[PDB]
Amino acid sequence: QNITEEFYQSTCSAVSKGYLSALRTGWYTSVITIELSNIKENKCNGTDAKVKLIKQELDKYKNAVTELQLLMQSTPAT
Amino acid sequence: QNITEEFYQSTCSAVSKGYLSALRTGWYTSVITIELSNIKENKCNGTDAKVKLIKQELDKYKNAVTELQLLMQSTPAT
Amino acid sequence: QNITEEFYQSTCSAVSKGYLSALRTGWYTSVITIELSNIKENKCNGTDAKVKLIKQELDKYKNAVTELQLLMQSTPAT
């Protein structure tokens, strides 16, 4: 990197040189995927401790799955 | 949705037809509210386990309540 | 705050008065720092419970430290 610049008093302007390109010319698509179970409401009453907690990380999970369903059938806004 | 478009060679221009409006003409305000207790520092030393943890989710809570107080008495920046 | 405004019918224009400045004229730099241990993979098999958990909050930790290393040796994009 030998960066360097010249001022032109004639035309009130300046050029910085010594740079190297990296231009976005094209695009690489690729599908990314996630597999999901769907399950019932079948659960439990109880419980000792470490499944009262595993049930909560599962409210959230369907909650999510619900929002993602809301994003139904349309062109996405660019 | 019958979407359709015409190019005008005369004037270097094109019109895409077959779309349906949804325009924001107005606004619906509505107050949203959250109730809060204020409590002392009264607490404890201990403890077995599941209140050493409930105390931490409560540092954060007042912490929050503090920042929200900082946003004191002014016009919000649009 | 005595805020006040005049409309000029002559020139289709208006001036709101009674405001007080706060202008950013300069800058205050200051380094902020965080100290880090580096550690081996030396760990364990086990375990009862409250170190199976402390190990996880430590995957994340190096994970982080890895990304921060990726941000290697360059001018930041303003």
Added chain:
Amino acid sequence: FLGFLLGVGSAIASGVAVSKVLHLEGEVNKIKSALLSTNKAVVSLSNGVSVLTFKVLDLKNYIDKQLLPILNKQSCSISNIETVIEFQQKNNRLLEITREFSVNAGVTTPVSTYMLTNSELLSLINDMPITNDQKKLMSNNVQIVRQQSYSIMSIIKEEVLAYVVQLPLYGVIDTPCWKLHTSPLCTTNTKEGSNICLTRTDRGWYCDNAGSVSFFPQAETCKVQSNRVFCDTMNSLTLPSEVNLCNVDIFNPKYDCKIMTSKTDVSSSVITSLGAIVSCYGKTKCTASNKNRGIIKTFSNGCDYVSNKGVDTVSVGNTLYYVNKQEGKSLYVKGEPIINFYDPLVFPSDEFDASISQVNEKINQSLAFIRKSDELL
């Protein structure tokens, strides 16, 4: 181009007006008391207006079923699970909400799921005093509605946190919109710099509205969603229906179509809903391909066009553009480049905000006080 003709509003004046009101001493209490232990009130204010109120989170009446239910077996001991779970998360919301207002100095958009849950949103939409098609529309497009909504921090007070939420009204629905794309049109002739261009400046979205037409000059203040167009009128002009005439006939006596002149013939493309306009000029390499079997067309200098049937992609100069793969019927309408009707000798090559007929007057001016002050001599 014409966005500089827009007016200028105050997007959250509606919302703030209500915030302002929530500092009247009587008001805050009038609210809490009105949600005695209901969760959706309709408190009319001591300004005197109706606002659907809404307690969405009770933490006082939660903490106070485990301040005293825990300032006794502690200090110190343990209680159980469930109570941690159902608070860790309950509190967590608030923490998000607090982050959100702190970074955006009290005003957020889009309005987040923490600020308002789909649960709470749709309910709001349901009892909103508005038509039924509004309701369905809003419900099938909540993440857009969230985008066009604002949320305005208002007060933290004794044992209560109020923030206002500003939600869109779609007072105009299911009317026909249409989108106008325009690239520059110049003369092709060979001497570099001997050449004159003209462009339609009137590009944008256009939607029929109460006998007139709302025009949206900066077409990224609109989001298409399949074949629905969400715009905001705050960024629009209200024009005569006649303005459409410019598409069939740019010369028409009824509406005076808008253009811009210049001498600056440069190559560029505009990607349309279903195709691609190409303005090819000079030594530029302009092309249209199919990804699979490569180049299927090469453009001549001038302004041309291709549909997205068969075409994936278009390059102009060193600029590759992917085309819109939406399905529909394109129709090419052959016509004489109007720029071919203008004598370069008396053409206004610098005009940023002009019309077809403004150019004409300016020409006659030139033409006259040439020919007259000439046979004169």
Added chain:
Amino acid sequence: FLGFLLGVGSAIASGVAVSKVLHLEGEVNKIKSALLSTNKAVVSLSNGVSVLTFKVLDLKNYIDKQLLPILNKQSCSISNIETVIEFQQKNNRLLEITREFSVNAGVTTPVSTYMLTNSELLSLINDMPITNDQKKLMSNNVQIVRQQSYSIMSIIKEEVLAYVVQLPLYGVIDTPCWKLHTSPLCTTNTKEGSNICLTRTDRGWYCDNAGSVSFFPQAETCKVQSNRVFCDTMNSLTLPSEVNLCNVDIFNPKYDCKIMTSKTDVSSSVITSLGAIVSCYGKTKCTASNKNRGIIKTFSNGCDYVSNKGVDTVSVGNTLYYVNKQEGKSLYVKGEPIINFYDPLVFPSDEFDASISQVNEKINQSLAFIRKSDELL
């Protein structure tokens, strides 16, 4: 309109200069060592400048009171609570911070509570070598200060993470600012297209400053907060005090007021601090209402105005604008529309960057070499 006259800076050059310096081999150590086990240093560098340093999080001297205090009863067993709690969160910060730099490729703004906690911020503000009114101001507006601050990732090294934080200096405070709003003014006469407009281009915020006036052309680079105006001078011009004269007298000999001509009479509104300007032209429906009892005024073609006392809302065409409910005293100043002083026959209908007197010269030019080259014949 005039934002194109602005200069162009490098917002984080100050900050980066310091980052750059933190790669000098001696420097990083000079820092750690200077925070031997203090938490706020003032290390002068091996460039040679003073920078308030700040260790905000010790994880080495935490992990190393439970690497060896846990590489012994494990492998394997359990220890207790407290240690998880007070690390889960301690580490968590860092994770946020790492998210933040990774998404914004090493440069964040606003500066988040994780990057700097109010705790740590206010302390910084306290020992900043600056006046006392600065201190109070910054303290009462931290979420703004955060907004105008930047945070710049700098180095991760042996056992240390340094990132620079760039914070605003408010070197100008409590001087009087004022805001200028301008809509376009045209002739009202009936033939569509027979009509000439002119607008003041000089709209913006204006603040008295060291005998001159800082002018802010794009007035959304400023945030009002009640009656305080936070601007950034990086987006300003420095003009003569005389420039205010244009408000009382746009013709004044002392400062030559700026305008723009066009023939493009289109209806629009500008919402002011305390009212609403209306530019009504053509067949447009322009109105002002009270939410409760509906339309209370209908505008005639031309440029008019209403205060927010009584008025909630204004519609122009199909565009509803809520008015600003801020409280204050408006005053209407009746005056002859200056556009009525101009002969349409010799008026410059295309001028984007012009002045009152530039128009005049251009007129005399026209007027003269009409009348002279005419009695000639």
Added chain:
Amino acid sequence: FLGFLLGVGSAIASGVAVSKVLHLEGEVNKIKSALLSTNKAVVSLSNGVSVLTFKVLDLKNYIDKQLLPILNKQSCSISNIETVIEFQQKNNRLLEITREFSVNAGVTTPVSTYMLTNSELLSLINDMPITNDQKKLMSNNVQIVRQQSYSIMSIIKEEVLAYVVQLPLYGVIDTPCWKLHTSPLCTTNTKEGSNICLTRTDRGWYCDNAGSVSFFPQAETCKVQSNRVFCDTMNSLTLPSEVNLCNVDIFNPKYDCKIMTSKTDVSSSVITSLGAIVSCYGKTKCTASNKNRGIIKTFSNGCDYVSNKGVDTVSVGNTLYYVNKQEGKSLYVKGEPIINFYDPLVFPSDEFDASISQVNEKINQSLAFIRKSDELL
């Protein structure tokens, strides 16, 4: 200035094309089945194109090693740790991802670590059918690549969530770029308003590319990273190599350099890569300092320049600018201000999109039909 000459694309048309395809009934299954229990497929579609597929998270085949492995000892009891840990987090990702799409109505950028982990990213980069320097470049600049990437929500279906990821191709690398800065140049003479300016409008980034030059008018659509310049060609023009000639010789016969005239002499600065341009005019106080020992130079009216060797900072009017501390060699090139070559009497003081020679023609026009229609009389 010239950004209005740009074309207009559809940044995610490529990506969406593929989304669209994922609703063909056969397609979704073709995918799941092709990742039978591999994690990186290459499914060619029932449109007929190749797309590197990628299962990154199996929750079905996790939940179904603890639905039945827990719908039996419960209801009710407890199981253990590890299973909570390694799901709390596994699920957590998804929750983020869901936040992200919901707020940005299905389209995110930058593409987050949740949407794609460095782990998964670099792997993608590795098997991307592209050159090796591309690979290394992308790998050493992932947080930039993330910034130029998009992520597009596509479908949630039976037991599968597909979202497309659009990643940059850097088809042009290691060619020489250079950056052009321009401030306005006016006459200095004393009567306020007797004065004429001219500016080069052609500022931007410039990069050699396939025998032509890609030009980027809005130079904040590019990010320098040390001495690499990431641009996007979507915002570029394709111009002749000759366009560089304007720097050595703005008068040259080969390329016709672009400028803008006005009478609006106002003081401003432009900070360069390695210095600072100053346009000082009127009564303005323009200066350059060293932080330590204060003012080291005072500028005269006109356009001048200083390097960042020795200089930290520059003030113009009430506007302080920190200079760029990057290291390099500046060179001042003394020259006569071309504005001194123009007779004010026949100079076009309003021209926003013009060239050097366009001004000349416009002058000759004036000059001629002055002198001719004059000796005439």
